[model samples]
Target: SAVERNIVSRLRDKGFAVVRAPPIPDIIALKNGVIILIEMKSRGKIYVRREQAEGIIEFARKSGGSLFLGVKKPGVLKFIPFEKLRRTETGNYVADSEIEGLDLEDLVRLVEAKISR
Candidate 1:
């Protein structure tokens, strides 16, 4: 998607080592030795496939990395941490109210801070 391309481009411009992982997630970005797995959804869409959700969970658990659901809707931008994700009846993962939304740059800062520790 164009939105995801733009995001990857911007992150790369910011010096993030970005890789597109199809069938798993949209991207995996590494910066300052920090790994960030991201699934991009446009128009506030957050539902993820069962396989993708399981893959993300397993990757994050094993790698001790961060998972993010990146949402882009018009002028709105949000990055929600993939924690305590609610499972739908269809076996998909969806964002809940407990998942705090954040600006894109703020989320990047948070990840950087986390890995710096």
Candidate 2:
């Protein structure tokens, strides 16, 4: 999708240091011992492949904290914090966003800045 391509392009321009790691592939980087992983996506369910989920958890144990993002409506991207992506009742993983903030540019800059620091 054009929107997806654009998001990647913008991130590159901002010096986010993105990498396509396999398994739980994401735009990964390390800054000042703070490893930040920005998983990019757009307008879809919050489900990831089994390997991806496993890989992400493994990375957290071995690497650093990571973020799961939900990109929606082509141009709008949202920061899906680890908390909101979880269910309250069963403490299970649930991907749902009731309110979204930030535009595409803001999202890109936010990611870049986080990874930069």
Candidate 3:
């Protein structure tokens, strides 16, 4: 037994077996072998549960999947990062005006390009 500091790196290295519909992500369907984990939010400030955030991160870590914050604002498509999200007393979240990242016109095609061979 050792200290599990590297969840993303170590878990992938050890190659873990984990899951459940118990704490489902907003979206986990982008790639076949390589998965995409996305949590969606709508207009205004977005909030996430503490447990929920951990669960999603854990899934991304164990599964070696890419995680993203999909925030829909004023009909524009933007995918944020939890790494860049703001933390609070309760849950973590990002302001709508602050939401910024890969401006996706088409997530499928964009993800396809990123998943390219």
Specify the highest-lDDT model's number. Answer: 1
lDDT of candidate 2 over 1-117, digit per residue (tens): 454456556656765555655545365644334555555554345644445556665765576565555445543566564434544353334464444445546655555565432
lDDT string, candidate 3, 1-117, tens digits: 011122223323433332313356665553445575666666556666688788887888887777777666665557675677776766655455465576543444555566521
Residue-wise C-alpha lDDT for candidate 1, range 1-117, written one tens digit per residue: 887888888889878999897546678888888888887776434677799788878887787678878877777667777774679998888775335677868867776676421
RMSD of each: 3.0, 4.2, 11.6
- Which residue ranges in model 1 land beyond 4 Å of their true spot? 43-45, 96-99, 115-117
Give Cα distance to truth, residue 102, candidate 1, Å. 1.9
Task: Estimate every model's Cα lDDT from 0 to 1.
Answer: 0.75, 0.53, 0.57
Candidate 3 structure, TM-score to reference: 0.59
Q: Which stretches of candidate 2 lie over 4 Å from their true place?
A: 29-34, 41-45, 48-51, 87-92, 99-117
Q: Tell me how many clashing residue pairs each candidate has.
A: 0, 2, 0
> Which ten residues in a row are the worst by lDDT in model 3?
1-10
- Assess the local accuracy of residue 18 in candidate 2 as a C-alpha lDDT between 0 and 100: 57
Top candidate (TM-score) = 1
- Residue 18 of model 3 has an lDDT of 24
